[PDB]
Symmetry: C6
Subunit: 66 residues, 6 copies
Amino acid sequence: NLQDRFLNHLRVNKIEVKVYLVNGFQTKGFIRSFDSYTVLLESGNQQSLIYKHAISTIIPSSYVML
Amino acid sequence: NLQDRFLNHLRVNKIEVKVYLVNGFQTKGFIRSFDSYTVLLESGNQQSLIYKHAISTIIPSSYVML
Amino acid sequence: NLQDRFLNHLRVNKIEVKVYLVNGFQTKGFIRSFDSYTVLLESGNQQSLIYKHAISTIIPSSYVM
Amino acid sequence: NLQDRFLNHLRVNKIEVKVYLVNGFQTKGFIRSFDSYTVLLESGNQQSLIYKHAISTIIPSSYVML
Amino acid sequence: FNLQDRFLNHLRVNKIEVKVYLVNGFQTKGFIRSFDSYTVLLESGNQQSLIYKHAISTIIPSSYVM
Amino acid sequence: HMALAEKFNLQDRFLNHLRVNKIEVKVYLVNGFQTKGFIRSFDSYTVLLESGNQQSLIYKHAISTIIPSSYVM
RNA sequence: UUUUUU
């Protein structure tokens, strides 16, 4: 399925993303890990466990070919 | 049924859509694929993985008949 | 059950509806079609595929039984 | 279970309710019926079909009990 | 182990007052008369509110629990 | 004899790490609001956040982001 | 707690 193949690609290849949340904030960093309900997004120093339901859209810094 | 016939129609025939997010923002693009939970939009060589729970409306640019 | 009978009553009597979305905005059209998760709303040649999870209220122009 | 015992008690007895929506709007009326996902709310000629995921609070006109 | 129902049941049967915070920014203070899987009945005087759990962001008790 | 399987549950593993090592977290709510505290407990739908005297039963569906005070592992 | 009630 699309979601987890897209996400793993961004994980293994360490592509940097912008993550827009439904409340309106945004954050960037690298998807270190993810499960069914959360994404762990690290930005060098800082970690953010992010709930998928709060994510609006993930936008990669470089083109993902699957 | 309806939802997947409609998205596939927009994907096969490469019709451009406006997607309206539940937090007021909006995006233009082409549906390049989709699963249960997400829609992969594309415009200007840029990609947006978009969670369906964040979409309120999809408005095709051209009339779709099923 | 209540929702499909209500939705379908509006599909086949071609009753116009206002559709209030959870986020404040508001549409208006005819229910062309629907399924578990979406509603196909048409006004003229404009189609809106609308996610139910994003729908607050559906208010018909007429009365429904 | 509480939700449907409560809703159906207000349906039969014809107790007026205020309905507070997640978006901050508020309807007032009578629950003519309901299923697992919506509430059919009526006051006069006016007929609101309301999605439960959109409702925050229902507030009766009169104490309800069992 | 069920954190939610044990916490809510403790509030219910020791009649602790709570402040219930809604995702839309409203708030409401009362006692938990009752709850099932989707809703909470919050009573204050002869006022009753059926609250949908999907609209609650937080419950803050005015006493301490255990 | 070997044990059986997993899988990777990232959510529980990260929360339980925060809970037992008493790492202060900042919690962002989907309505924009935020709060601080220590995870005392959690289940499928809720997290118990204690800060001093205050206890908060926060619903997960209302949580946007959890930022810990220290790096996790 | 990822597309119609935690």
